Each structure stands twice: as structure tokens, then as C-alpha cells.
Amino acid sequence: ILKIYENKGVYKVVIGEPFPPIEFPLEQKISSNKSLSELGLTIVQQGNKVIVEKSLDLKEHIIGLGEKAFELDRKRKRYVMYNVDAGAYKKYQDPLYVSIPLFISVKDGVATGYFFNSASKVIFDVGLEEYDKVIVTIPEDSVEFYVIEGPRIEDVLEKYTELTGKPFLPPMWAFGYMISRYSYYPQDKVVELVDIMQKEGFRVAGVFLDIHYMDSYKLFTWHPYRFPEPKKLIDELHKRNVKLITIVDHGIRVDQNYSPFLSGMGKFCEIESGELFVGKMWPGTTVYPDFFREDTREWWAGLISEWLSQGVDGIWLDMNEPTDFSRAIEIRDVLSSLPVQFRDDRLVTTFPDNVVHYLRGKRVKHEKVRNAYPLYEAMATFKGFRTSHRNEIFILSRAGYAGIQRYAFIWTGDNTPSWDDLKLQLQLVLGLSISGVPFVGCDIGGFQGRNFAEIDNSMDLLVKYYALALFFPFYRSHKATDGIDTEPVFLPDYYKEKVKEIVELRYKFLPYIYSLALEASEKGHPVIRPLFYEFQDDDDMYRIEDEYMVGKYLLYAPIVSKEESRLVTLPRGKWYNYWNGEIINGKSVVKSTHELPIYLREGSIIPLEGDELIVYGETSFKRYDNAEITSSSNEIKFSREIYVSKLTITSEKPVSKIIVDDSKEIQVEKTMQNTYVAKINQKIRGKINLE
Amino acid sequence: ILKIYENKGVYKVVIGEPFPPIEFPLEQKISSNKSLSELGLTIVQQGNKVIVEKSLDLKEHIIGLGEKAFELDRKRKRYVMYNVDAGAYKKYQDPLYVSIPLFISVKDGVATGYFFNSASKVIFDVGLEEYDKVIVTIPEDSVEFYVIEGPRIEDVLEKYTELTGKPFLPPMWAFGYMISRYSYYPQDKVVELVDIMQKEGFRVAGVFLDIHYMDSYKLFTWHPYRFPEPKKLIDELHKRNVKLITIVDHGIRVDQNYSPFLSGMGKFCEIESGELFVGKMWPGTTVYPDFFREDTREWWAGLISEWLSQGVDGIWLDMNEPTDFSRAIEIRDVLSSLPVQFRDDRLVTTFPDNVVHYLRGKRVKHEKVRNAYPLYEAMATFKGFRTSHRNEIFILSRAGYAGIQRYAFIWTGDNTPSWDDLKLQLQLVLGLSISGVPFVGCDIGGFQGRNFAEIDNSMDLLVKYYALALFFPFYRSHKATDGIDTEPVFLPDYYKEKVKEIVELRYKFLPYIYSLALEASEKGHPVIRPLFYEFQDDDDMYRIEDEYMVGKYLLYAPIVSKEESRLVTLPRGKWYNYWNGEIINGKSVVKSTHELPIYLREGSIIPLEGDELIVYGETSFKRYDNAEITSSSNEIKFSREIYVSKLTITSEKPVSKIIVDDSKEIQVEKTMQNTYVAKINQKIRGKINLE
Amino acid sequence: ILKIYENKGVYKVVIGEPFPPIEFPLEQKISSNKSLSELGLTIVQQGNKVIVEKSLDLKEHIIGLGEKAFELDRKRKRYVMYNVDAGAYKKYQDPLYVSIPLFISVKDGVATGYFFNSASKVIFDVGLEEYDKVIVTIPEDSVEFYVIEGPRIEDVLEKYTELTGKPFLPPMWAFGYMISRYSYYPQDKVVELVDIMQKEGFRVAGVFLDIHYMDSYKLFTWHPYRFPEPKKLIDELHKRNVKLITIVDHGIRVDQNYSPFLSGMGKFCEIESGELFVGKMWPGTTVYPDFFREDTREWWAGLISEWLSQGVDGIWLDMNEPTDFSRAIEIRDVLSSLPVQFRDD
């Protein structure tokens, strides 16, 4: 059986009788006229497997697949989609924590998307098995996938987001500077550190509490000695306008007197033979919630809601691949004596094969729906915020699947501090971003501490991390237990000042970043983007990976080496050097002039902290507070009255004066080449004219 | 800290501040005038260990230690007391399922007992480390042991039994012929087999239902297909006057919808770190009841009581060493693939070292109290019978500790059919018997089926098993799943008739056996006894192991070889050949005359089936129904009026007539040498005279 | 039984009845009016172990611990003090060759020292187990440690040095440019190299001779073919004003005709059961001097003295962790043929 449904440039191809890990609504199920051959696809059904083939041309680009430790153009590699605890991952390691079975093809400048809605171990052989083919193997007898027409990459993502879910809109503080560690404690130390940070000028949005805050790693408990007074801790942080985010794993301790274990009974994962799936995790012997069940989701939402009611501001979901250590520990117990070195097979940390779940009333094998586990956990956790009537929602997840963007931010896990990691992190967050997950980031400074030689803890590298993630949506510093203290307040003045200036610059651009976040939640456009996203028709762009676009207007080329300057590749069009005012013509390579290489595209409007505003060329932009700004000839229109402090206009033609609402004239000042400034400091009814 | 108490030939030596696995009430608490020196003991306290030394003379005998696969005189061996699933045990394998830390020394004809009340891994080095010493090592810093004065071995056992508990008095049917298998099913087959057995003349007292009757090995459940109508089965069997005994393991399946798991929550064993101890047993992933706790014992008694209420007549406790297979399975998973062979270390089936229990409110390590686990399980099960107001109690246990005789019968586990096993089983049951556990037996025909070459399933060997256990308290035929069918009804007429006659002979002696059972429950005297028990002053007796005494009057020398006759060693005194009537002088060796070599001691009274009575010499005997019979010069007195059918008097001097109550007279018919019979068939108010 | 003594800013804390690896004489003792709580310490005695705790503030610095492949400020790491042959060590590898159980705390600009006089496998958990604590675990039931007041770091070191011993004053040439290799030989090549070095303007203070100079790695012997005339070599070096330093390991070859083995008999290390501890080192099967004994030390001093009398200027003690390879070799013999990779423990 083969059915093809069409609507809005999205074709739903159904092979056999699929049982999706999650059902995505289609607001118009119209049988399509186009056939597989007109779609350029070949399909084969074999021993409980479905193979989908597509040709691959020499100049064709393949992007997506989410979190991959590889170049953005995915050709010449066989990818595996299977959520796994990657440990201290290195480049070219696969698979990782997140699985987004979506890839976009750009041929002759036209983009087309392919989304396979299966959470099983899907294989994407991109021109490896057959140099001229993309072969997708789904380890199931049935499957549903979608062909998403473009022609722009942005067009594919809008439709994809429409299909799987728009990103939730988080609070502005979720994009602030977060400090974290594994872990901060006891409670008095948490407050002491926050005080020193603030006293030295660092604006801290929130602090993350890792597993040391729990009582014997038991979820929803406070360590009796380190955190005897949770209320005191909470009020002190809130008193300092600092949010508190607490980590929450997925393992429930098999403890006779542990409430969650007793109340969750009946809603835990089982194994083929009917018993509970008992494994090993932080709290020791543990069982896991079967988040695929509606009731398990309701139970979890309740615990979360109750947990949030103490004043906790956010939830950090970890180890939710889902991960289990019983197999690893079993091996370590039997061969512990032997003086031999074990191989590091990460797949050993996934759930065993005999584990089963109940999806929509049906009993299914874990291997068929594994990757959607974190999605359902996030869903239940999001539901927990609703149950608490909490409008400001903040959820961080390590693992994910298509649709995860509806409920959480995703960070790249346990990275290793090193110069090469700077480039790796950029590929990771951009891969995730181009795959439908907009709110992403990495651990600034790297997670790994000092448990192995290949770790670089130099301070100038640390500064480069802060600078690298300058525009990442999620900006958090996190470090392992045995790692050196990486909080800015512990750095020599020389380095401390640099971090301080970088963080201040981030807050200065927060308004723009947040506006892009609103755009993401409304249209599904990613916040940070690889250059080929805005210039998909230029093949060169698919090889540029140490540069990224922030929204549609800002190009950032972070310095990812020890050099003092770097070569910057500029796409077609004109670009304005943010720091010295120079305007360069696109499709060229130039040398960076500042430590933070920022360029504005001709046709930009950028809202800055303190009601500042930068305008260059003609375009239209919607600020996060709903205020729309439009620039044309020599006029800047406002959808509604708004305050404007400092206005910066970049222009090749001189600007002698501006006129507010036809009457008042404000003094213009040339601050540098092509740069004109006007100190307005007043509300504007609806427009400004340039002369 | 050394303290010695005393009360009527029982010295209680306390080293340090002991925390016994179970507390044994000592009548008084009188202090002793004796010192260790006077008691012939040396004591040392070291690294959490207590070493107790005693000298050992060349002619000194050491007996006891319970279930040991060794000669009855224990010298020249280092014994370990640690309950363990022995698997397919062979001779000289140690340790086994039961641990009774009691040994009796017989020096210069005088017996003295030594009981160390510790359920930890106690070591009894009997003249091995030091040829002239008995060294006992208790792996604890404190300990309480008792020195029990004799001078007769029977004296020691009475005091010992007084201390640890008198054996319960079971119903007479508990000593009948029991058929069992692993397993009988479905329910219709159980009834069909019982019918054939009865139709062919075999009087079956009860049938045992092994684990196949359960639903997925879940305790207290019936297999929906094999036993869909258990109530019907129980009536079908009860209608035929056949008892039903069901096996009950100690593992509770970790199942979300399994009632016992949910109701037992809070009462299961834990590990050092606080989580539940999750292991592996028949039902798969399992937890175990912490029987050391008072509340757990109540909970268990409730389930048992409820289980007994359907009409189940007896409980068979198995795998209660306690045994666990998680370690073994862990090894098999990690090294399964290797073409390498594994060593059979039985200790791998015991509970792990991190398991803890709550004894009398105190948290203790499993290794300190392990051996008492089965004792507390039996205790709770016995309590379950009381809760059901069930007066006829029947409990079979595989493992045990001192005091187990208060609650259950013990059978020797998984023996292997073979000619050598005949001698082994005799040492096992006699060792248990001389150690305070009177109601014992072995699997007639051997448990092991055909899973390995060294198994002998010949029919004449099977017949020898039936004959060997002729007088054992517990008489049950049990066989493994893949073993040939061993029920008598499946044997060729030649062999079937032999088994039939042996079973009929057992029922003929049941009255005597049961009277000895009453004596056991009242005075703690064992039913079957090694020869040295009645003749402890003759060194020769400690080397005789293929002969045993049934009570004080009957000597049985079973044929444990293929021969047609054997050499029989007779102790001091005169002995009457039960089959040919010949009388022989003790302290001699004679050849057997019948297939079942039975001899009556001068001074015997033996009640037989159908009110028959055998009298030889002068003695006093208490029948199970309380009627006391006494024989003197030429008179047989009765404590109360009782019916008497056939009376047999063995005498070297002729007996022409007997006189009932100084009135009526009955003629005597000499049936064979020294044998005179009188068909009385009438009640006797109080006496019979011989002339 | 925990007591505290005092003397010129040095608090000696005694837990139980310690048997120090070496005794450091503390002159005018006298019991202290100070308490542990005042001293800011917590002490626990358990299963043959002593745990000493101190709080650790956010701005507090911890330095010391000797030879550690880590940042100078030691916070956030659990250190092990156990001399070990580190092999081709990399950064963040622990432990290494040297064990100095001393750490200095600098809080509010004030320094205080803590010296635990135990040569056992001492653990220094510096804000790792507990973020706000420094936990020191000594695998012994008794122990003596010292709290050394500053307030300057230099003050702490002066007192510490006063306690454990002042550094000896070596000759000025010991700080000159030394050339070495594993190894330089035969003897003519040693002189040739020194000549070229001097001719090209390099002022060489001394040359080190590694194990290739010995006869089959036997201590206090000269290789019969590589070094047939050691006297001539020493004279040539001295004529050129170059010192000669020779390496000396700690392994004595179990050789029936090897003098040091025969003369050292009675002074070697043993094992619990009473036999000699026979191991493996450069010369093959070897025994080791029990330097903890006075007679062994005297015997060794004699061999050294005799060795120095030929004109050797310095001694280079190597592999003295002490190191032994019998366990490693045992593993390599049993799993030699197995096509697997051994972990480097």
C-alpha cells in the first residue's frame, strides 16, 4: 500500500500502515496527483525495513539532520539517528544526543525538505553507499515521511514548523547570562557566588543547580545538609532578581519509602516479559516513567507543578536520551579484575532491547520509538508549567526529536574545551538550528574538567568561548566537578574585563535577539543561521562554517583561533562594518578589524538595549514588543508610538538632519565614516525623516 | 568482655556484646562458677572475629554440623556454615543448603554439645588446621555460644531442643507416601495420575505442585491454562482423600500490576545505599521479603493464610537459602559468547554483600545473619497456618538454621540418582537428625533427570531408594522435568510389585513412626538415629553409616548395593530378626536374610497398623494417641483401655497362652522360631499376662 | 586520644598513637591552649582511617602538594599522594613521582600551612567531594599533622623547613649546564662529545652517565667493554674541569657472584610471610635494600663512599619511588599472546 496526500507544498507519503511515534495534524488531507517518480523517489519494502532512494547530483547540497558533529553540507557520510549519551564526544562522532530525521536538499538553488517521521534507528546514507544517491533506511515495515516544497530554505522550515509545531515563546530572561556548574553548593555558597558576580558588574539572569542539590540524587528532594532551607535560598536569589533552574533527571529510585516511586507505580516502563524495567542511573537502582502514556504524562506534570510551586523558575531535563547504565555496570562488574582496556561503545548506554512502551494504547518496542522519549518528557514538563499557570516557561533538554522545539531549549551536552571545539560547537548549534530547533547553545568554556589530558583550560580560549556564543540564543557557562572555576570573577583583571565587555555587548543586543525569538515562535524562522540560509543560491556559502547570521541582518565571524584577526567571507550585497563604519561590497574576503567581527547587511533595522536603534537601508522589522519599524527612501515609520533614545543611521550619502513627526528637528552627528548619530531621547508618534 | 551464665547443664558463654540472629530464652540467668579454663576452651578476639579453640583427642568423636556431605564423624575437615544453592551436589561438596552450628563431642563415652548462635559464615575446623584441635571461627566481633552437658548424646539434644525449640507435631498424613514432580500439570493430569496410583493399589497421602502451576512463576497465582479451575482440583483430590501441597518461593516479581509486590512495598530487603535489593529468580526481576522484620512476617502470614483458605493443605518453601541468580546471569551475559568454560562457584548464587536487613530494629549486613533467613520465613509461614486456625500443619523447607525444627520438615534438595547417592543420602538425613532436625527425608529416586551423563535411572536402583527411605520421616518421590517418569504405576510389574510392598510395609509401621514423631515434639528425640546415638560408648559405631536406628528399638540395615545380601553390624545386646524370627547376640557381624534387613532390639514395643502390636522384652512405650504400654516380667500393662487386634510376642522361652485382664484367656500359635502370635481382636482394660 | 602541642607558631596535632614514617624533632613543646574548633578543624576516626576536615571559602586559595600535573591553585580536585613511576606522563595525570603532604591555605591574604606526616596513600580532596570543604583522608588509625601559622607564605615555609630540615648547600657547579643522555658510551665517545661541546663554546659543568655504563645493569660495576678504563675517563673529565655524575638505581641483582647481593644479605626488604621480596628491575631478578633500617643505610653509605672514591662527583638516584616491574611482567607473560590492549595502570 502507498498513499500520497498533498496540501501547501507538503506531500505526505504513507508506506504500508504506519504507527508514527507522534501524530502530526494535517489540515487538509487531499489525495495527490503527483507520483513517486514525479517526486524523484524510489521505495522498497523488505525484511521489516523501508528504503527510500533519491538521486544526488555533484552540485547538490544536503543540510539538516540536526545535531551532527560534521560539516553542515552532509554529503559522503552514513548517519545514524539514535539518541545516545555521547560522553566526552569528539568531532566526527555519531550519533549524538538529538535525532531530527529531517534533511533539506538544495539543487539548482531550489530547496526541498524530506522529513521521515520515525523515531527508530533511521539511517541516512548521503552519497556514501552510492556516490550519486541518498539512501534512507527505516528499520520498520511501514513509515510516513513528508516532502516539503520550498523553494527557499526558509519556506521549507516554515512548512516543517507548521507541521511539527511552532517553538514556544520563552521569557526574555531565558536569553540572559546563566551561570552553572556541576555543582554549586551548599546553598550559602550559591548566594555568595551570585553576590560576587553582581558586585563585580556581571548581570546574572539565573543559576543552574545540578544533581548535588538532591538528597542521594532523588528527584524532587533537597539535600538535608547542603540545602536545609530551600525557601531561604529561593527568596535570596529572587531578591537579587536571579532565576533558579533545577536539573531533573528521568530516573526514579527504586526506594520503598520514596514517594515518587510509590505514586508513579503503574506508570513505569516495562520489558517484553511484563516486569518493570529496572536499570541503573544516578540514584542507583531505578525505574523510568513511560512518558508515551497520557497518564504517566499527567502524573509527571503534577510532580513538576508541585516542584515549581516552591518558586523554582525553570526545569533542566538531563540524561533523557533516555540513558541507562545497567549494561555498562554489568560489564564493569564481570571484567573489573582483568587488566585490559575496554572499548568505548556509547550504544551500551541506551535502553536494552527488551524494553517496551504503550503508545496510544499500543505496546511497542523501545527501539521503534526511542528517539521520541525526550519529546514526550518535555511535553509533560511543559504541561507541568501550564498546571502551575506559569506563563514564563523555561525548559532545557539534552536529547530531542522532531517537535522538541514546541517545549524546550537544547544545549550541546558535554563538550571538551579546546580550540577545535570552537568550530565543532558552531556546527552543532547551526545544524540544530537549520533543523527546526531555534533555541540552542553550548556550555561556554566547555563542560569537561580535568579527567583527561586533551583538555585546554587556558583563559584566552575561555574568552573565545564567550565571544563565540555572543549571539547564541542560550548563553550559559557550565563546568564539570573537577574543572577549574570558570566564573569571570575568578579571572585576572585582564581576562575578567574582556568577559565583562562581551556579556555587556550581548545584553546590548538582547532586544534584537528576543525579537528574532518572537519571529521564531510565530513563523518558525531560526534565530542564528548558517550563511547558506540567507544566500542558498551561492555554492560558496555551504563551505563557510566559522561564520553565522543572527537573524536576517547581522553577520558575525567569530575569531576561532589564536590570531588577532581573521579572513571574513562576505556574501553578495553590501556590508557595514559595525566597529569602524566601513562598507564593503559583497562576494569578497576581507580581514577582520576588531576582536568581535560584526557586519550589518544593507537593509537592516536593529533594536538595541535602552531603546537604541540602528538603521541601514530599507527593510521592515517587528520588535519583540510588537512595535513594527519600517525604513524606506528617507523615512522610518513606526506602527505605534515608541520611545527612542539614540538613533544610528549608516549611509553612504551624508545625513545632515532628521525630523521627528514633521515638526521637531534633532541634531545629527557624524561619528565615523558612513555613521550618523542622533540623540532623540523622546517618544515618536509615527515617523522620522532624513535629510 | 567475657561473661558466663549457667542453668541446668547449659552454660551460655557471651563474648563481647552479641546481637544474635535470633534470641533463645534461657530459663534462668544464673551466673556460673566455671571459667573457660575449666570448660576446656580458649578464646581470642581479633579483627572483627572470634576464635574458639578446644583440644581434640585421638579417640574423640565429633558429630553434628547438620547437613554435611561427609562421614558422620566429622574429624579432619574444615567446614563452612553458609546456606547455599548446591545445585547438583556430589559427595564431599560443602557447604550445602542448611546450617546448624552445633557439634557434639564424645570423649571417654561422655557427650558434650557446643552451639554457636551465629548465622554468619562460621568455620568449623575439626582437626585440620591443627590435628589436635577443633577451631571455630565466627566472622563477628561478638558472639554467644552454649556448652551443653550430656553425658548421653540424647541428653545434649534434649537440652539443645529445650533451648532452640521443640519440633512441632505434624499430622499423621505428613508421614505418608507423597508423589511429586517438577512438575505435574495441567490440573486434569494431576487427577488422572492420582486415580491410576490409587487404582493400582498405591496409598497416596498427598501430591506436590511445583512451580509450573503458577502464572509466570508469580507467587500465589494459578496458571490460567494449566490450572484454570483450582477449586475443582482441590475438591477432586480431597474427594480422594489426597492432600495438596504447593511450592512457594521467596521471590516477589517486580511487576506493576502484581498485588503482592504492591502490598509488600515497604517490607522488602534493601542494600547498603538504601534502594531495594532487586535481583533475579524464577519470575525474572524480583525483590525479596525481609523476613527478619516483625511486620514483614505478618504480611507474609496473611498471604499464606489467604492461600491456605482455598483448601491447600501444605506449604513447600524452596530456594530459601536465600538464593539469587542476578550475579550468575550477569556473568553469563558478559561472557556468554566466549568459547571458554565457567567454573561452578556455588557461592555466586547467594545474596550479594551489600544487602541489608532490619533485625529487632537494627540494620545488619546480610552476611552476618544469612543462615537465619529461612528460619524467619518458616516462622512467618507457620504463623500463616495459625492465622487460618489450621491445626494440621505441614511445611517443607530446603534451607534452615538452628530452630528450624520448630516449623518445618527438611528434605535434602537436588540429589543425583546413583548407587553412591544411597550412602550419601543416609549421611545427609542422619547428620540433620543428630543435629536437632527430626523430620527429614530425601527425594526417592533422585531429583536430577537427564541433563548430564552421570545419572543412573535403572529401575532396581529406584527400588533401592524406596527401600532406603523405608523409615525416613519424610517419604516423597520427586523428579526433575526431563527425568523419566518414576511413578510406580509406570514400572514393569516386577518392579511395581516391589515398590508396592515396600510402601505397604511403611504404612504398616506408620503407627510406630508417628509415635516417635510425638516423642520428638515432646522431648526432642530424633526419629531416625545413627547407631552411635544409642551406643555412644562403642567406638565401632561411629564408622557404621549404612545402617540406622528407627527410634530406640528398630535397627535397619538397608541394602545399598547390587548384592542380594549384605553384612550387618549389630551393636551390643540381643537382636531379633524381624523376618525369620532368629535372635542374635550383639557386637557381631551377620549376613542379611531378607531384602529389607530389619532387627528388633531386646526390650521393644512396636505398634503397627490396624492396632497390631509387637512386644519383645521389657520396656515402656508411649503411643501417639497417648496410650502408654509397658512390658515387664510376664505382663503388659496399658495406661488406658485400647483395642488390640493381633499381638506378637517374641521370646526365647515358649509362650503357651496369654490372659486378658486376669479373666479371659487366649491361645497362642507359634508362627516361627521365638515368635508367638495371639489373635486378640478386642479392647483391653489394663493388662495381659504371659504363661 | 587527640592532643595538641605548640612551639613558635607550629601546632602539632596528634590523633591516637602515631608511628610517623620519620620523626621531626619539635623542641620546646608544651600543650596548646588552642582547640580544633578554634583551629577550624574537624576530625574523625573510623575503620583504620583518619579524616581531617577544614572549610573552604570561595576566594580561598590552596597551594602546595608538591609535584602535581595541575594548576598551582589546587581547588576542585581529589589528589592522591603515592609515589609512582608515571611513565610518559601527561597533564592532569596523578599521582606522580614525589609526595609532599603539605598544603598552604591563603584566606583573606593570610597563609596557614597544613602538613600531614604520613607516607601512606593520603588523599587530599580539595573542594571536590564537598565544594566548600578540604577533606584529608589518612589511611591509618593514627596520625600526626601540623598547623603552621604564617601569615606570609614565606613564614609558613620557614617554619616548615625548620621542622622537616633545611636544604643542604650544594656546590656552585651543581647549578651549571649539565649534559646527559640515556646513554652516552663507550667512554671514548663521552670524552669526544665533551671536547666538541667545549670547543664550540659551551661551558659544560658535568656529564651524567645513565645505566648503559654498568655491567648488565649491576650497581657499582663498569661495563667491561664500554668502560674498560674508568680511571682514564675520570681523569680526562677532570682535566677538562667536567664533573662526572653516575646513576644508581635501587635494585640489587639476585646474583650468586655479585658482591653487593652477598654483603647486603640480611638488610633487604621482606614480605609478610618472611621471605625476601624478590622482584624485577633493570638487572632482572632483584631484591631491594630496606633503607628504613640503620644497618642498611650504613651498608649503603659504604658502597656509595667506595664508589665516590674513584673520583665520581655526584649520585643520581633513579626509580626510587620505589618502582618494581614484577607485576607488570607477570601480566605480560600470561596475556602476552592474547591480541588485546592492556590499560596503563
CA-nearest residue to B273 within chain A is A284
Q: Please report, for residues A452, B247, B402, B410, the alpha-carbon distance to residue B398 in angstroms, rounded to integers and kept in the order given.
A: 53, 11, 14, 6
Shortest Cα distance, chain B CAs vs residue A257, angstroms: 7
- Under an 8 A CB cutoff, do A254 and B278 touch? yes
Closest alpha carbon within chain B to A289: B256
Strand-pair partners of A614: A606, A648
Question: In the 8-state DSSP scheme, what is residue B440?
Answer: E
Residues A407-436 as b/e (b if ≥16 CB within 10 A, e otherwise) read bbbbbbbbbbbbeebbbbbbbbbbbbbbbb
Under a CB-based contact definition with an 8 Å cutoff, are residues A488 and A197 in contact?
A: yes
Contacts of C335 in chain A (CB under 8 A): 339-340
C-alpha span between C279 and C296 (Å, rounded): 18
Kind of pairing, strands B252-253 and B284-287? antiparallel
Among candidate residues B180, B228, B221, B231, the one with its CA nearest the CA of residue B204: B180
The C-alpha cell that represents B256 in the structure block: 506493576
Listed by the residue before each break, gaps in chain B with C–N over 2.5 Å are none
Neighbours of B603 (CB within 10 A): 17
DSSP letter for B653, please: S
Q: Where are the beta strands (DSSP E) in A16-83?
A: 30-31, 42-46, 49-55, 61-64, 77-81
Contacts of C42 (CB under 8 A, 6+ apart): C36, C52, C53, C54
CA distance A274 to chain B (A): 7
* CA-based nearest residue to B666, from B654, B655, B675, B653: B655
Tell me the β-bridge partners of B299. Answer: none
Q: Write out the three cell numbers for B42.
A: 580458649
> Is residue C190 classed exposed, middle or buried when 0-12, 13-18 and 19+ CB atoms within 10 A define those classes?
buried
Solved with: X-ray
Q: Where are the beta strands (DSSP E) in B598-640?
A: 598-601, 604-608, 612-616, 619-622, 628-631, 635-638
Residues of A with CB under 8 A from a CB of C: 183-186, 189, 192-193, 196, 212, 339-341, 449-453, 455, 457, 481-485
For residue C54, how many other CB atoms are within 10 A of its CB?
20
Among chain B residues, CA nearest to A264: B256
Q: Which residues of chain A lie closer than 8 angstroms to B326, CB-CB?
A: none
Residues of C in contact with A483 (CB under 8 A): 76
Contacts of A237 (CB under 8 A, 6+ apart): A190, A191, A194, A207, A243, A244
E strands of B453-513, at which residues?
Answer: 474-477
Distance CA C151, CA C156 (A): 7
Cell output for A43: 521505495
Q: What is the DSSP letter of B371?
A: G
Q: Which helix (DSSP H) or strand (DSSP E) does residue A12 occupy?
A: strand A10-15
User: Contact, B276 vs A255, CB < 8 A?
Assistant: yes
Taken in order B249, B251, B255, B261, the sign of the CA dihedral is: positive
Report the distance separating Cα B205 and Cα C26, nearest Å. 87
Q: Is A662 exposed, middle or buried (0-12, 13-18, 19+ CB in 10 A)?
A: exposed
Instruction: State the first-to-last Cα distance of chain A, in angstroms, to the nearest integer.
Output: 68
Please give the DSSP secondary-structure letter assigned to residue C215: B
Contact B512, B552 (CB under 8 A): no
Indicate the helix (H) or strand (E) that contains A315: strand A314-317
From chain A, pick out residues whose CB is under 8 angstroms from the CB of B255. 274-276
Q: Reduce the DSSP state of residue A465 to 3 states and report it.
A: helix
Give the span between the Cα atoms of B384 and B231, in whole angstroms: 20
Give the β-pairing of A98-99 and B675-684: unpaired
| Residues belonging to chain B | 691
Amino acid at B375: L
Exposure of C251 by Cβ count < 10 A (0-12 exposed, 13-18 middle, 19+ buried)? Answer: buried
In chain A the domains, ranked by start, together with CATH numbers, are 1-151 (2.60.40.1760), 152-527 (3.20.20.80), 528-602 (2.60.40.1180), 603-691 (2.60.40.1180)
Selection from A124, A222, A244 nearest residue A178 by Cα: A244
Question: B189 CB contacts (<8 Å, ≥6 apart)?
Answer: none
- The residue written with cell numbers 538528597 in the block is A215
Whole-angstrom distance, CA of residue C265 vs CA of residue C276? 10
Q: Which residue out of C78, C91, C331, C345 would a mutagenesis test of the A interface target, given it has the greatest number of A Cβ atoms within 10 Å?
A: C91
Q: What residues are paired with C102 via a beta bridge?
A: C115
Q: What residue type is assigned to position A211 of the chain?
A: I
Q: Could C76 and A183 be called an inter-chain contact, meaning their C-beta atoms sit closer than 8 Å?
A: no
CB-count exposure of residue B103 (10 Å: 0-12, 13-18, 19+): buried
Is C92 in contact with A450 (Cβ distance < 8 A)? yes
Nearest CA to C14 out of C32, C38, C40 is that of C32
Planar angle of CA B126, B132, B134, nearest 5 degrees: 30
The alpha carbon of residue A16 and the mean position of all alpha carbons in its chain are separated, in whole angstroms, by 34
CB under 8 Å to A259, separation ≥6 — which residues? A220
Which member of B255, B257, B276 has the closest CB to residue A255?
B276
Q: Which residue in the set A216, A265, A273 is minimally distant from B256, CB to CB?
A: A265
Backbone φ and ψ for C45, nearest 5 degrees, come out as: -115, 125
> Of B432, B410, B251, B387, which Cα lies nearest the Cα of B324?
B251
Q: Provide DSSP, C281-318.
A: ETTEEEE-B-TTSHHHHHHHHHHHHHHHTTT--EEEE-
Active site annotation includes A414:
yes
Resolution number, Å? 2.5
CA distance C93 to chain A (A): 7
Rounded Cα distance, A523 and C166, in Å: 75
Q: φ, ψ for residue A494 (rounded to 5)?
A: -50, -50
Cell of A568: 571574513
**Do the beta carbons of residue B101 and residue B372 sit within 8 Å?**
no
Q: Please count the other Cβ atoms lying within 10 Å of the Cβ belonging to residue B163.
A: 23
**A-chain residues within 8 Å CB-CB of B275?**
253-255, 283-285
User: Where does residue C139 rank: exposed (0-12), middle (13-18), buried (19+ CB within 10 A)?
Assistant: middle
The helix/strand/coil state of A89 is: coil
Asked whether the beta carbons of residue C58 and residue A453 sit closer than 8 angstroms, the reply is no
Of B236, B318, B487, B519, catalytic: B318
Q: How far apart are CA B105 and CA B459, in angstroms?
A: 40
* Residue C335 buriedness (CB in 10 A; 0-12 / 13-18 / 19+): middle
Find out whether B144 and B108 touch, Cβ atoms under 8 Å: no
Residue A37: how many other CB atoms lie within 10 Å: 8
Residues of B in contact with A324 (CB under 8 A): none
Q: Given an 8 Å threshold on Cβ–Cβ distance, is A255 in contact with B265? A: no
* Residue B207 contacts residue B190 (beta carbons within 8 Å): yes
| Cell matching residue B669 | 500359635
Put simply, the answer to whether C92 touches A455 (Cβ < 8 Å) is yes
Scanning the structure block, which residue is given the C-alpha cell 545445585? B87
Using the structure block, give the residue that is written with the C-alpha cell 617554619: C159
Residue C218 forms beta bridges with which residues? C215
Cβ neighbours around C29 below 10 Å, total: 11
Closest residue by Cα to residue A60 from A105, A104, A101? A105
Query: What's the grid cell of residue A388?
Result: 502551575
H helix intervals, A312-458: 326-334, 366-369, 373-387, 419-433
CA distance C150 to C223: 53
Short-list A166, A239, A185, A179, CA closest to A205 = A179
| Cα–Cα distance, B648 to B605 (Å, whole number) | 10
Which candidate, A481, A480, A503, A500, places its Cα nearest to that of A489? A500
